[PDB]
RNA sequence: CACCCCCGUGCCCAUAGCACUGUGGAACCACCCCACCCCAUGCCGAACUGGGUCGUGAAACACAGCAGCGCCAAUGAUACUCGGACCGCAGGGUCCCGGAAAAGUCGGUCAGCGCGGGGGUU
RNA sequence: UCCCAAAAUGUAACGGAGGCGCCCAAAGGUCACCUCAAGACGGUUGGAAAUCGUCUGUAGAGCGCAAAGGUAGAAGGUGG
């Protein structure tokens, strides 16, 4: 051995592939299944007709049109004012 | 066993000293408390008992171990650890034990003289930091363990300390003039 | 001060020596554009406690007051001014500087007197009669004398907006 | 001079002054008219100068403190990462900015305390007096 | 304090429901057994105990429940939903409930 | 929406919030009262809860005044920039052409809009 | 996991920072309920913080670990 610290400290190697954002934009005719938003916390609160996966994800329960409602930030929503 | 003079001496004498638009306004007593902040300096899964059982017999209630604030300061501190003890009193038990004090507690106190004035909780509430439990009508050194103390809280509807002091002593209370 | 043009376009001035301000109140927010040089020699005097003759081209004299001014970095030269059309009984509030006079009994003592807060602002100035200045005592001030708002003599009427106990001038020590 | 504690490194970019007033803290002032990195030591080289010239008063203000750590060549190579967190501390100063502004002493008795100081700065400046009345 | 109602209320989904919600203000002895329709802030039936009580106020418990459930009848509502408030589904209030939970 | 006020419940969800001040009482609401047990507070029927006056309006609430604090927030000029074209060895910078803040200021407000139930216009 | 990365995504470097190779019979499912940090005034061993109390107190706390996003009408804190 010797008498020092295992590996050399203060590095900078590696990071993470990473994703997220928004999958469906205002005006898009969502569908059954489609995903609308992959977010981390509660950036966008599942509005009307919008399910929310375990990972704060947002999917379409039914079919219809994608719509965006943002009340003074803090809480946002995606609803589906369906076409039919 | 009281409450009448309570009003009588307190209430009447109060419009009859003051002048309240109602009797609901006049100052009152919300509750009397007793924290048993033992332990820490004494970690006795034994001592704690000396607290409750006892406290219990004086305040006629079973107190809550106001455990550690999960505070683990530089010294002997930590997460939630049975440190203090609360036994809150209101109405009946409040008065029932309350009386015991205005009557036997302080009246029956060695090296007693009264109680400092000075406005405490500007909130009209009065504070009472009792010590040696040796002066209780329930404390028995000849059937206990060691010997401790305690602090009691005066919760009053008094809006002003002026008004409090009145109610305070009216009801009964010794002051060191 | 005969400011004349007043369009969103300033070409015909951005080269030709002219500043470019706006004066209002709440009624009329007339577009503007005066001359550089003039307001240049002007504001200097009256400062923000000096209302002036505003006969914009055509002839419509207006009374206002230098509210805020925004000058160039790199070049201590000003670029945009905002005039606040004078009122009658109350304007808003005014920015009034602190001044000394008479030698200080601290100065010669060995220290110096510091005017902590240069210009001072006071609640309710009173239009028509607004102090275009403010002289203050300092003599009395020795080694560590602090004067505040609650101290400065007022011009009869004016009410001090800033907090009283705030130190206006303090005769600092040596070194 | 050097800051008390922080992160350790930085970067580099520029564009004209932003929060560099004018009058305040005194009557006379000095102005930086050019992009530079003022070296903390290039300030002492200024303060300590102006000092001498003023037996007393102190009425000298240095409102430019150095919020920045630059690095260096640990001899030469190039096979290693970031280096020399401790080369020296800098105070990026943009045009129009104000590093200096004395107070109390006579004009000329101030039109020198700067002149000199100027002589140890990397940039070209000029002195200023009043009419400065934006926010207060 | 209001938490309790908002916690109850909020958990009570709205349109996703399609159903309706029955309230109650039995905090006082002036219950209001109100019924509302998700979308439009419209109140459908509702059978309090305000139209007198016969001296029963913490008693007309069922009166209003029974009054209520039968109430929506002249409207026809099969699927409703209990949107109580602080009123931790006890007795005086479980009244309206059972009472209505069958009076319909 | 005949006039009003009161309770519940929305939309909206600080220009609709705070504070200071006044108004209201026995229609409503609240405190208050008792509470052995239904059910309940890791102690306390304080809170949950059950059975109810009187008394009060003091507190909680509702209304109303007010703006001193919050929140909102111009216009003007500006920062910056898509595009086009130039300068300085370099740091950096400019002109033409649209876009154009943020902060500050003028000023703005202490909401507005519903559904239903109660009680009044002696 | 942050920054770099040039407001969609994605984008390097022996570029700048920091964690993981688990843990939890429950720190789960569900149903109830409570809500913080902190300072100030007053109060017993206490006396710096901390226990009790009363005001302020959109949270300046929490969330098992690194960070960010997220969150009190709780993902914060208890019990069936």
UniProtKB/Swiss-Prot annotation, chain A:
GO terms for molecular function: rRNA binding; structural constituent of ribosome; tRNA binding. GO terms for cellular component: cytosolic large ribosomal subunit. It comes from the Bacteria. Keywords: Ribonucleoprotein, Ribosomal protein, RNA-binding, rRNA-binding, tRNA-binding. The keyword Hydrolase does not apply. The keyword Coiled coil does not apply. InterPro entries: Ribosomal_bL27 (IPR001684), Ribosomal_bL27_CS (IPR018261). It holds the Pfam family Ribosomal_L27. GO terms for biological process: translation. Part of the 50S ribosomal subunit. Contacts protein L18. Binds the 5S and 23S rRNAs and also the tRNA in the P site. Belongs to the bacterial ribosomal protein bL27 family. This is Large ribosomal subunit protein bL27. The lineage of its organism: Bacteria, Thermotogati, Deinococcota, Deinococci, Deinococcales.
Curated annotation (Swiss-Prot), chain B:
Transmembrane segments: none annotated. The keyword Ribosomal protein applies. One of its GO terms (biological process) is translation. The keyword tRNA-binding applies. It holds the Pfam family Ribosomal_L5. GO terms for cellular component: cytosolic large ribosomal subunit. Keywords: Ribonucleoprotein, Ribosomal protein, RNA-binding, rRNA-binding, tRNA-binding. Gene3D superfamilies: 3.30.1440.10. It comes from the Bacteria. One of its GO terms (molecular function) is structural constituent of ribosome. InterPro entries: Ribosomal_uL5 (IPR002132), Ribosomal_uL5_bac-type (IPR020930), Ribosomal_uL5_C (IPR031309), Ribosomal_uL5_dom_sf (IPR022803), Ribosomal_uL5_N (IPR031310). HAMAP family: Ribosomal_uL5_B. NCBIfam families: PRK00010.1. This is one of the proteins that bind and probably mediate the attachment of the 5S RNA into the large ribosomal subunit, where it forms part of the central protuberance. In the 70S ribosome it contacts protein S13 of the 30S subunit (bridge B1b), connecting the 2 subunits; this bridge is implicated in subunit movement. Contacts the P site tRNA; the 5S rRNA and some of its associated proteins might help stabilize positioning of ribosome-bound tRNAs. Forms a bridge to the 30S subunit in the 70S ribosome. Part of the 50S ribosomal subunit; part of the 5S rRNA/L5/L18/L25 (CTC) subcomplex. Is known to contact the 5S rRNA, 23S rRNA and the P site tRNA. Belongs to the universal ribosomal protein uL5 family. This is Large ribosomal subunit protein uL5.
From Swiss-Prot, chain D:
Pfam families: Ribosomal_L16. Keywords: Ribonucleoprotein, Ribosomal protein, RNA-binding, rRNA-binding, tRNA-binding. PROSITE patterns: RIBOSOMAL_L16_1 (PS00586), RIBOSOMAL_L16_2 (PS00701). One of its GO terms (molecular function) is tRNA binding. One of its GO terms (biological process) is translation. One of its GO terms (cellular component) is cytosolic large ribosomal subunit. It comes from the Bacteria. Binds the 5S and 23S rRNAs and is also seen to make contacts with the A and P site tRNAs. Interacts with A site tRNA mimics, and is probably one of the key factors, along with a helix of the 23S rRNA, in positioning tRNA stems in the peptidyl-transferase center. Belongs to the universal ribosomal protein uL16 family. Part of the 50S ribosomal subunit. Contacts the CTC protein (RL25). This is Large ribosomal subunit protein uL16. The lineage of its organism: Bacteria, Thermotogati, Deinococcota, Deinococci, Deinococcales.
Curated annotation (Swiss-Prot), chain E:
GO terms for cellular component: cytosolic large ribosomal subunit. SUPFAM superfamilies: Translational machinery components. The keyword Ribosomal protein applies. GO terms for biological process: translation. Gene3D superfamilies: 3.30.420.100. Keywords: Ribonucleoprotein, Ribosomal protein, RNA-binding, rRNA-binding. InterPro entries: Ribosomal_uL18_bac-type, Ribosomal_uL18_bac/euk. One of its GO terms (molecular function) is structural constituent of ribosome. It holds the Pfam family Ribosomal_L18p. Part of the 50S ribosomal subunit; part of the 5S rRNA/L5/L18/L25 subcomplex. Contacts the 23S rRNA. Contacts protein L27 and the 5S rRNA. This is one of the proteins that bind and probably mediate the attachment of the 5S RNA into the large ribosomal subunit, where it forms part of the central protuberance. Belongs to the universal ribosomal protein uL18 family. This is Large ribosomal subunit protein uL18. It comes from Deinococcus radiodurans (strain ATCC 13939 / DSM 20539 / JCM 16871 / CCUG 27074 / LMG 4051 / NBRC 15346 / NCIMB 9279 / VKM B-1422 / R1).
